[PDB]
Amino acid sequence: KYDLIIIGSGSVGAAAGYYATRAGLNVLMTDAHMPPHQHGSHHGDTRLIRHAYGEGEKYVPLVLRAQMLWDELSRHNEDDPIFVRSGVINLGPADSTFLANVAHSAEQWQLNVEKLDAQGIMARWPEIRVPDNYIGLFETDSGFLRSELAIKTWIQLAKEAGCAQLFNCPVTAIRHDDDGVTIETADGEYQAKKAIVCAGTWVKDLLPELPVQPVRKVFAWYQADGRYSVKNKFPAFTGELPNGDQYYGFPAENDALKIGKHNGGQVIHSADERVPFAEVVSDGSEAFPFLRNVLPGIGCCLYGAACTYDNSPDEDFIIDTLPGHDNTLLITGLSGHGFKFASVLGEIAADFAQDKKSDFDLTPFRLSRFQ
Numbered sequence: 001k002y003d004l005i006i007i008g009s010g011s012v013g014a015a016a017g018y019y020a021t022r023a024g025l026n027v028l029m030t031d032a033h034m035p036p037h038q039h040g041s042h043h044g045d046t047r048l049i050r051h052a053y054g055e056g057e058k059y060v061p062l063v064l065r066a067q068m069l070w071d072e073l074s075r076h077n078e079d080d081p082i083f084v085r086s087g088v089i090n091l092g093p094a095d096s097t098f099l100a101n102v103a104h105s106a107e108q109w110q111l112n113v114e115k116l117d118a119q120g121i122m123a124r125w126p127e128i129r130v131p132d133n134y135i136g137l138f139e140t141d142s143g144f145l146r147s148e149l150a151i152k153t154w155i156q157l158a159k160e161a162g163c164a165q166l167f168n169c170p171v172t173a174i175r176h177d178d179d180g181v182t183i184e185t186a187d188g189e190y191q192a193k194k195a196i197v198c199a200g201t202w203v204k205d206l207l208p209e210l211p212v213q214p215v216r217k218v219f220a221w222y223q224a225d226g227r228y229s230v231k232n233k234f235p236a237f238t239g240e241l242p243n244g245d246q247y248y249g250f251p252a253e254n255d256a257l258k259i260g261k262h263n264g265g266q267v268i269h270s271a272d273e274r275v276p277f278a279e280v281v282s283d284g285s286e287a288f289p290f291l292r293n294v295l296p297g298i299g300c301c302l303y304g305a306a307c308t309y310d311n312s313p314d315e316d317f318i319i320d321t322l323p324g325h326d327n328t329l330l331i332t333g334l335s336g337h338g339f340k341f342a343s344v345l346g347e348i349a350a351d352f353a354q355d356k357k358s359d360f361d362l363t364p365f366r367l368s369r370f371q
């Protein structure tokens with residue numbers, strides 16, 4: 001009898017719950033665990049945000065709206081900023097398709113991005129060391145996000161707003177009537193007028209036909225020092241190697257620099273198959289090829305993580321209503337660059353719930369593409 005059932009109250013679903021309840025809807029929130037947990041793709045301290053987007057021009061207006069919502073959310077917690085404006089530097093070769101989309105999309109949307117020289121960056125940040133052939137695009141208004149905190153707050157805000165939340169209770173199957181959507185759980189049976197499916201990286205074993213492939217990814221913490229910090233103006237980064245390998249990174253927190261590879265990772269299929277940090281042996285030395293070249297004074301790996309990419313076959317998002325049911329909307333294509341969008345994706349779901357209006361065009365996130 002609910003107005004809306006959220007299947008996965010994770011990073012996308014947590015937003016979806018808050019916005020849909022604040023919209024004034026009778027909402028049910030579900031997860032398999034206790035939302036800020038270690039079983040999804042929201043754990044680890046931080047998640048990156050970039051406006052001038054190298055992945056594609058199609059993302060820009062959404063991440064711009066996302067940023068607005070992150071700013072509005074950060075308001076609710078004074079002692080702990082959810083968004084930190086450290087800035088984001090984009091590193092890579094001058095003739096790269098990725099940096100070509102950062103520069104082009106900065107121009108159209110009037111974004112604060114500085115083209116910087118190979119010698120220029122080394123002169124501004126002595127610690128960052130690139131080939132002479134390289135170029136850097138510094139983003140001023142960008143930075144990163146406290147991913148765990150973002151969930152934590154979205155839940156309590158929803159919980160206070162009268163949202164019904166069923167957390168440690170996995171969903172087992174989705175059923176369709178003609179009015180709305182039923183979900184049978186190992187607990188009981190609940191239904192709503194509409195539904196949003198955001199079970200994330202394991203939605204496959206709840207909706208098997210989807211063309212999304214979970215992949216074991218890992219980020220790690222290396223030993224840094226005060227001059228690699230936000231205090232010393234050190235920015236969060238994305239790098240390209242002559243390899244074509246992409247790396248993401250964050251300004252050293254308390255004497256620790258967080259890095260990760262983006263392009264690789266070993267393919268898995270079960271939640272059990274996600275072996276913890278040090279268990280497979282690429283992990284401890286995964287960020288090394290970037291670190292010795294680009295950040296040579298960065299030292300040893302200290303500890304690290306265990307996350308999973310929700311990969312689509314073209315690496316773009318899947319934001320579409322289910323093939324047979326306009327009744328239900330799913331968000332799942334988020335292939336490792338989705339958290340920055342969490343806030344905006346919850347809003348468009350809240351809009352969807354009260355059959356409201358987009359602004360954005362979600363055409364390139366069709367389910368149709370494939371075939």
Ligand SMILES: *Cc1cc2c(cc1C)nc1c(=O)[nH]c(=O)nc-1n2C[C@H](O)[C@H](O)[C@H](O)COP(=O)(O)OP(=O)(O)OC[C@H]1O[C@@H](n2cnc3c(N)ncnc32)[C@H](O)[C@@H]1O
Nearest residue numbers: 008010011012031032040041048171200307308338339340
């Ligand atoms: C893997 C990864 C991702 C990542 C990243 C680094 C790594 C190693 N760095 C990022 C970054 O720097 N900047 C950025 O914008 N994104 C980055 N990402 C991607 C990001 O983590 C993900 O896009 C996003 O966090 C995941 O979104 P989503 O909401 O779809 O997935 P989730 O947070 O894990 O939430 C899903 C929830 O659903 C629950 N669940 C799963 N199955 C069920 C069933 N069947 N029943 C009920 N609930 C279910 C999960 O428990 C989870 O809480």
Ligand code: NA
Nearest residue numbers: 309310334336
């Ligand atoms: Na993901």
